Curated annotation (Swiss-Prot), chain B:
It comes from the Eukaryota. V-ATPase is a heteromultimeric enzyme made up of two complexes: the ATP-hydrolytic V1 complex and the proton translocation V0 complex. The V1 complex consists of three catalytic AB heterodimers that form a heterohexamer, three peripheral stalks each consisting of EG heterodimers, one central rotor including subunits D and F, and the regulatory subunits C and H. The proton translocation complex V0 consists of the proton transport subunit a, a ring of proteolipid subunits c9c'', rotary subunit d, subunits e and f, and the accessory subunits ATP6AP1/Ac45 and ATP6AP2/PRR. Expressed in brain (at protein level). This is V-type proton ATPase subunit C 1. The chain holds residues 165 to 273 of 382 of the full protein.
UniProtKB/Swiss-Prot annotation, chain C:
Subunit of the V1 complex of vacuolar(H+)-ATPase (V-ATPase), a multisubunit enzyme composed of a peripheral complex (V1) that hydrolyzes ATP and a membrane integral complex (V0) that translocates protons. V-ATPase is responsible for acidifying and maintaining the pH of intracellular compartments and in some cell types, is targeted to the plasma membrane, where it is responsible for acidifying the extracellular environment. V-ATPase is a heteromultimeric enzyme made up of two complexes: the ATP-hydrolytic V1 complex and the proton translocation V0 complex. The V1 complex consists of three catalytic AB heterodimers that form a heterohexamer, three peripheral stalks each consisting of EG heterodimers, one central rotor including subunits D and F, and the regulatory subunits C and H. The proton translocation complex V0 consists of the proton transport subunit a, a ring of proteolipid subunits c9c'', rotary subunit d, subunits e and f, and the accessory subunits ATP6AP1/Ac45 and ATP6AP2/PRR. This is V-type proton ATPase subunit E 1. Belongs to the V-ATPase E subunit family. Expressed in brain (at protein level). The modification Phosphotyrosine is found at residue 53. It is found in: Apical cell membrane; Cytoplasmic vesicle, Secretory vesicle, Synaptic vesicle membrane; Cytoplasmic vesicle, Clathrin-coated vesicle membrane. The chain holds residues 4 to 57 of 226 of the full protein. The gene is Atp6v1e1.
């Protein structure tokens, strides 16, 4: 039966699909992490500029 | 018609690295084709010829293989008189052949 | 020989695994690039507006 050849094709494709899907999941997670770390660091910049502004006042 | 012989289980599709090709061969030459398709190109898995049907002259089979093989495979099939007839379970085309056979007979009446 | 074709394909199919790993590594390289690009663009655009406000 042709399953002896066909399952070797399907196994390589399933392995391939998993490796690509994991990288796409990582891509989405990294983009979310960039927004969150930017939101933390931008407040640190604001707080420093606020301290300098109060000193000038 | 492909609509009389095409069935889903004979196909490997909907994939990044995988293809199904389709080839017609004479009934005498089929006895060579059963092995010889594996010699046409690299990236072909063994035992992947799958006959859809046979007749008074000939066979049509699917060949299931990795995507890199396909253009060398099809060209070298033609150079050896193995006739490429690609139809990748085309549901819209088999449905069109069935519905239009019924319709044009009915409309002619 | 069916066994020799099986020995050949068992080697040759490793190129599909390599191309899939390289495709995943390209998506990961894009994830690292777009992380740095998006973070930098967002932070510096807002930081400029914050410096202008103050």
């Amino acid at each position: 039966s042709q399953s002896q050849g066909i399952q070797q094709l399907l196994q390589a494709e399933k392995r391939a699909a998993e490796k690509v899907s994991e990288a796409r999941k990582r891509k989405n997670r990294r983009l979310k992490q960039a927004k969150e770390e930017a939101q933390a660091e931008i407040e640190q910049y604001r707080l420093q500029r606020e301290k300098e502004f109060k000193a000038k006042e | 018609s492909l609509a009389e012989i095409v069935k889903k289980d004979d196909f490997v599709l909907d994939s990044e690295y995988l293809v199904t090709l389709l080839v017609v061969v004479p009934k005498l030459n089929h006895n060579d084709w059963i092995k010889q398709y594996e010699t046409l190109a690299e990236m072909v898995v063994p035992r992947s010829s799958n006959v859809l049907s046979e007749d008074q002259d000939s066979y049509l089979c699917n060949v299931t293989l990795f995507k890199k093989a396909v253009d060398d495979f099809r060209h070298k099939a033609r150079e050896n008189k193995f006739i490429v007839r690609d139809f990748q379970y085309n549901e819209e085309e088999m449905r069109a052949d069935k519905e239009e056979m019924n319709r044009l007979s009915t409309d002619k009446k | 020989s069916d066994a020799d074709v099986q020995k050949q394909i068992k080697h040759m199919m490793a190129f599909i695994e390599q191309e899939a790993n390289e495709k995943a590594e390209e998506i990961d390289a894009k994830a690292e690039e777009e992380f740095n690009i998006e973070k930098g663009r967002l932070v510096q655009t807002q930081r400029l507006k914050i410096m202008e406000y103050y």
